[PDB]
Amino acid sequence: ARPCIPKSFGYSSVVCVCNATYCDSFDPPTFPALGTFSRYESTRSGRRMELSMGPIQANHTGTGLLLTLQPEQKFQKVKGFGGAMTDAAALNILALSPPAQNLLLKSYFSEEGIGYNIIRVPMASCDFSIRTYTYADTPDDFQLHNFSLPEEDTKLKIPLIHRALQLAQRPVSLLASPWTSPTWLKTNGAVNGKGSLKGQPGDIYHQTWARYFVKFLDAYAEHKLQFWAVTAENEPSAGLLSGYPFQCLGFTPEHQRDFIARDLGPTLANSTHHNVRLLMLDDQRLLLPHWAKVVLTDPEAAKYVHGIAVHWYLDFLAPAKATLGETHRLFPNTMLFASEACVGSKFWEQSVRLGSWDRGMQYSHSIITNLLYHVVGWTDWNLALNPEGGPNWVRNFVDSPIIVDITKDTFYKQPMFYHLGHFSKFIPEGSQRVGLVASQKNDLDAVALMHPDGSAVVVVLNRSSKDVPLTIKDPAVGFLETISPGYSIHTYLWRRQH
Template sequence: MASLLPSLLLMALGFLPAVTLSAGSGKCVARSFGHDSVVCKCNSTYCDSVGSVTLPPLGQYSSYLSNMAGSRLEPGQGQIQVNSTGQGLRLTITSYQKYQRIKGFGGAMTDAAAINIMSLSSGAQEQLLRQYFSSEGIGYSVVRVPMASCDFSTHLYTYADTPEDYNLDNFTLLPEDINMKIPLLQHAQALSPHPLSLLASAWSAPAWMKTNGALTGKGSLKGKPGGKVHKSWAQYYIRFLEEYAKYNLTFWALTTGNEPSAGEMTNYSFQALGFTPEEQRDWVALDLGPALHASSYPHTHVLILDDNRLLLPHWAKVVLSDVHAGRYIHGVAVHWYFDSLVPAEISLGTTHHLYPDYYLFGTEACVGWNALDRGVKLGSWNRAEQYAHDIIEDLNHYVVGWTDWNLALDQTGGPNWVKNFVDSPIIVDAKHDIFYKQPTFYSMAHFSKFLWEGSQRVGVSACGETHLEYSAFIRPDSSVVLIILNRY
C-alpha cells in the first residue's frame, strides 16, 4: 500500500495510521518551564489520556501528532491514497518484507521511582500508574526491576550481606521491595489488560563475594566460574525469583548483570560487578544456566550483556559462539548510552545477522545523564526527539523492545545516593501532589500504545530523498502502524 502524508504531519513526532482516539480522553493541561516545549500537568482528579483505541473504517487512516508547539497525541483522520501520483512525499509499505516481532516497551521500577510514586496521594498514585499501564494509558508491558540497590536507591544494600553465607540462609528482601516496589508492581499488574513482562537486573553481588570487598568500584566475583562463589551468585538469582513469586510476581526474563563493563573501571562511583565476555560466558554455562534449569523457573529468559551496544558484536561473538552457554540464552540486552559512537548497522545489525536466533532488547535509556546536559529539563522537546530517534533506529535494526529507565523521579532527578541525577518521562512534585508528563512520555507513547506484543516490522520506503525517520509494522489484528519522526 502507499499513503500520502497530510501536510499537518510535516512537524510530526509520530504518525500512526490504523488507530483512532476514543471519546472521553482529556486534553493536556500545559505548563511551561522555559524550555522549548511544555509538560502536561496531572493531579489526583485529572490527567490527559490518549484513551482506548478502535480501528478506523477500511480505506481510512487515523493519526496521532505530537510536536514542539504543544500537540500531544492529537488525533486526525484521512483517506488512504493508493497508487497516488500527486505531489508530496509517498511512503510505500511492503507487507511481504517481514522482520522481527515486537515484545514490548516500558520502564524501570527503581527504588527512586517507587519512592516518588508513593510520595503522592493515593488518587495521584492511581493516576500515574494508569498513565503507564492501563488500557486508557500508553500500554507499558515491560517493567525492569533492580535486584537490590542501584544508584537510584537511597543507600547501598544487597539481599545477602551476611559474610560467607554461601548457602544464602540469610537472604531476605528489604523494605524497598516489600513496602514499595512489590505493592506498586501488583497495582500496575492489576491495571494492565495483559500480564506484565517483568525483567530483573542485578547491579552488584554482595561485597563478601567480590574481589574488592565493596559494592562499588572495580571488582568481580572471587574465584572462577564453576567455583563456590559463582554458584552462590547464581543461586542468588533463583532466591530473588522465589521471593517475588511469593507475592504473585513472576519474571519473564533476567539479565546477567547491569553494565558489566562498569565493574572493570577503577574507582567506579556506584554499584557494579565486573565481567569480561569470557567470564560471563563461562558463568552462564557452568552456573547460572544450570541453576535456572534445575529451579522452578527453567523458562525464565536469560539476556546477556545488559550494557552499551558499542560492545557489540564482540561481546555476542564471545558468549553466543559457545554452545554450552548459548543453549541457556535467549537474547542480548543493550543500553543506549554512547549509541552515536557506533553505527546501529555495525553493532545491532551485525549481531542479528550473526546470531538471528537470539533477539535484541533495549533495557535502559534516559536523558540528562551527560555532564554537558545534566538532570531534569521540564518541557524539553529536544530530549523527546532523542528518544524517538533512538527507538526508531533500534527497531529498524532488529530490536524487539525498548525499556526506559526510572518510571518517575523528583524535580532534582532523584533520589540518588551518588547524586547521579537524570531525567524521567514523569517528574513528581510531591509538595503539591502533582506530576508532570514530559515530552519524552509522549515519545514513548507513540510506540508503547500502538505496537502491541506480536506486532511485526515490515518494509517501508520513501519515494525520493527525505529527512524523515520512519518504521512500519503490522499488528496481530492486521492493522498497519506507521511511525514517523521529523527532527527538522
C-alpha cells in the same frame, strides 16, 4: 477523553500537568472504520497525541514523497515497551497522594494511557537507591539461608508492580537485573569500585551467585510475581573500572561466558523458573559484536542465552550498523532487546529539562533506530524522578518521562513520555516490523509494523523545521495523504482488508 494541561518551564516545548484531580487521558481504544485511518499527532508547538481521522484513497498522483508499506517483508516480532521500577521511581510515585499515584500509573499502564507492558526490576540496590543493600548481606552465607527481601521490595516495589498489572489490559512482562552481589562474594569487598566475583566460574562463589538469582525469583514468586527474563548482570563492563562510583560487578566477556555456561544457565534450567529467559550483555552497544562473539560461539554458553540486552545512553554518539547490524548478521537467531535508555546524564546539562522537545526527539529517534536494527523491545530507565532527577545516592541524576513535584502533589509528563507513547500505545506485543520504502531522499524517520490481527501502524518522526507533505501507500488498501509537520511525531493506524 481529557486533554493535556500545558505548562512551560522555558524549554522548547511544554509539559502536561497532572495532579490529584486531573490528568490527560485517552478514550477506550477503538480502530478507525475500514477505509479510514487514524493519525495521532504530537508537536513541539504543544499538540499531545491528538487524534484526527482521514480517508484511505484508491488513487494517488504527484511526485511528492511516497512511503510504500512492504507488508510481506517481515522482520522481528516485538516484545514491547516499558520502564524501570527502581527504588527512586517507587519512592517518587508513592510520595504522591493516592489519587495522583493512580493517575501516574494509569498514564503508563492502562489503555487510557500509553499501554506499557514491560517493567524492569533491579535485584536489590543500584545508583537510583537511597540505601545500599543486597538481599544477602550477612557474610559467608554460601547456602543463602539469610537471603530475604527488604521493605524496598515488599513495601514499595512489589505493591506498585501489582497495582501496574491490575491497571493493564495487556499482559505485563517483568525483567530483573542485578547491579552488585553481596560484598563477601567480591574480590574488592565493596558494592562499588573495580571488582568481580572471587574465584572462577564453577566454584562456590559463582554457584552461590547463581543460586541468588533463583532465591530472588523464588521470593518474588511467593509474592505472586513471575519474570519473563533476567539479565546476567547490569553493565558488566562497569565493574572492570577503577573507582567505579556505584553498585557494580565486573565481568569480562570470557567471565560472563563461563559464568553462564557453568553456573547461571545450569542453575536456572534446574529450577522451577526454567522458563525465565536469560539475556546477556545488558550494556552499551559498542561492546558488540565482540561480546556476542565471545559468549555465543561457546556452545555450552550459547544454549542458555535467549537474547542480548543493550543499553542506550542517548546523550552520546555510537554506531548502530557496526554494533546491532553486525550482531544480527552474525547471530540472527539470538534476539536483541533494549533494556535501558536514559538522557540527561551529562553533568553539564540540567538533569531534568521540563518540556525539552529535543530530549523527546532523542527517545523516538532511538526507538526507530532500534526497531530498524531488529531490536524486539525498548525499556526506559526510571519510571519517575523528582525535579533534581533523583533521588540517587551518588548524585548521578538523569531525566525521566515523568517528573514528580511532591510540594504541589503534581507530576509533569515530559515530551519523552509522548514520544515513547507514540510507539508503546500502538504496538502490541507480537506485532511484527515490516518494510517501508521511500520513493526519494528525505529527512523523515519512520517505521512500519503489522499488529497480530493484521492491522497496520506507522510512526513518522520529523526532527527538521520543515513541513513535509507525504503519502503512505498500502498496496493492498490504498493511499494515506498526509503531512509531517516540522518538529512533529505522528502515529498512523488502519485496518487492512485483502
